[PDB]
A paper describes a structure:
Despite the ‘rule of thumb’ that blood feeders from independent evolutionary lineages utilize different protein families for various salivary functions, the saliva of sand flies contains apparent homologs of the two-domain long-form D7 proteins of mosquitoes. In this study we demonstrate, using binding studies and bioassays, that the sand fly long-form D7s do in fact bind both cysteinyl leukotrienes and thromboxanes, and thereby serve as anti-inflammatory and anti-hemostatic agents in both sandflies and mosquitoes. In this study we show that the long-form D7 proteins from sand flies are functionally like their counterparts in mosquito saliva and share a conserved structure. Consistent with these structural observations, the sand fly proteins were found to perform the same anti-inflammatory and anti-platelet functions as their mosquito counterparts through the binding of cysteinyl leukotrienes and TXA2 in the N-terminal domain, but do not bind biogenic amines, as this function is performed by the yellow proteins.
The structure of ABI15936 was determined using single anomalous diffraction methods with a selenomethionine-substituted variant protein prepared in E. coli. An initial model containing two protein monomers was built using the experimental electron density map and then positioned into a wild-type data set by molecular replacement. The model was then completed by iterative cycles of rebuilding and refinement. As suggested by sequence comparisons, the protein is made up of two linked odorant binding protein (OBP) domains with a well-ordered domain interface fixing their relative orientations. Although ABI15936 was crystallized in the absence of any potential natural ligands, electron density was observed indicative of a non-protein molecule occupying the N-terminal domain binding site. This was determined after refinement of the protein complex to be the detergent Triton X-100, which was retained through the steps of protein purification. The binding pocket of ABI15936 is much like that of the mosquito long-form D7 proteins, with numerous residues important for ligand binding being conserved. In the structure of ABI15936, Tyr 44 is oriented identically to the homologous residue Tyr 52 in AnStD7L1 and can be assumed to play the same role in binding. The C-terminal domain of ABI15936 shows a clear structural relationship to mosquito long-form D7s but the protein does not contain the interior binding pocket known to accommodate biogenic amine ligands in the long-form D7 AeD7 from Ae. aegypti and the short-form D7 protein D7r4 from An. gambiae. Comparison of ABI15936 with AeD7 shows that the region connecting helices α9 and α10 is truncated relative to AeD7, eliminating the equivalent of α-helix B2 of AeD7 that makes up one side of the ligand binding pocket.
Author numbering: 0 to 196, 198 to 230
The structure:
């Protein structure tokens, strides 16, 4: 189950993972400077980030306005105006989710960057003060191989890596929406790993890790290779 508020590693992962999933986009460079142009790839990049932050409810096709507000409150940032526009059901398209949130973004850019650690100084401070989280610049394998993290406090073998690959969340619950298609894992294959993982504790993480590796032996190696900055 997802935890809120989202921390600086969790927000960083959502941005970078969604950037990788749209890496051929014409507007990629604009996203780097916090500009979200009105084009299809940007629409779907925006939907991806809302989803990967844990802020899109796929069941009612609505933003988790309650958790968005919690992020502001937890970060001591004033609640922005215009919340009504981002609230309520969408039709599920990238276009609709973009249209419902673009003014909210454009009208509150720097407060949103503050609340979601989108400022280098604020992110650097979070990581400095949370040394038990994988630092930027360090690979998942190198971090999780240290301090017996892969054991998960028990007898596991991939407890830490499965978390940082986002196969499972902090609760060792599988992350159902994870997209590893470009790594050679189809949606059906990933779903089968989720289903294979009534297991309990970090055994869910190990089951997800082993199942993914079984489908494609390189996929998790690629995520590890990408992991210094995701
Ligand atoms: C290599 O370094 C790349 C760093 O880029 C990280 C910043 O990502 C770019 C910003 O992109 C977005 C994506 C989504 C959003 C939304 C609209 C979803 C708002 C948000 C993040 C405040 C919830 C805003 C900016």
């Amino acid at each position: 189950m997802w935890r809120y508020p989202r921390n600086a590693d969790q927000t960083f992962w959502a941005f970078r993972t969604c950037q990788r999933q749209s890496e051929g986009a014409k507007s990629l460079r604009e996203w780097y400077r916090w500009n979200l142009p009105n084009d299809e790839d940007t629409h779907c990049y925006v939907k991806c980030v809302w989803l990967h932050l844990g802020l899109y409810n796929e069941q009612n096709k609505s933003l988790r306005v309650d958790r968005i507000m919690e992020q502001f409150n937890s970060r001591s940032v004033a609640i922005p105006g215009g919340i009504n526009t981002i609230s309520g059901p969408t039709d599920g398209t990238c276009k609709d989710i973009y249209d419902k949130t673009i003014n909210f973004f454009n009208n509150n850019v720097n407060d949103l960057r503050t609340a979601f650690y989108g400022i280098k100084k604020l992110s650097d401070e979070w990581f400095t003060q949370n040394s038990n989280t994988k630092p930027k610049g360090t690979k998942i394998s190198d971090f999780c191989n240290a301090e017996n993290r892969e054991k998960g406090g028990a007898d596991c073998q991939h407890a830490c890596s499965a978390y940082y690959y986002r196969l499972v969340d902090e609760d060792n619950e599988p992350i159902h929406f994870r997209n590893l298609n470009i790594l050679g894992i189809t949606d059906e294959q990933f779903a089968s790993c989720v289903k294979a993982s009534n297991k309990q504790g970090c055994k869910v993480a190990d089951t997800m890790y082993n199942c993914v590796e079984k489908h494609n032996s390189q996929a998790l190696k690629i995520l590890d290779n990408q992991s210094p900055t995701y």
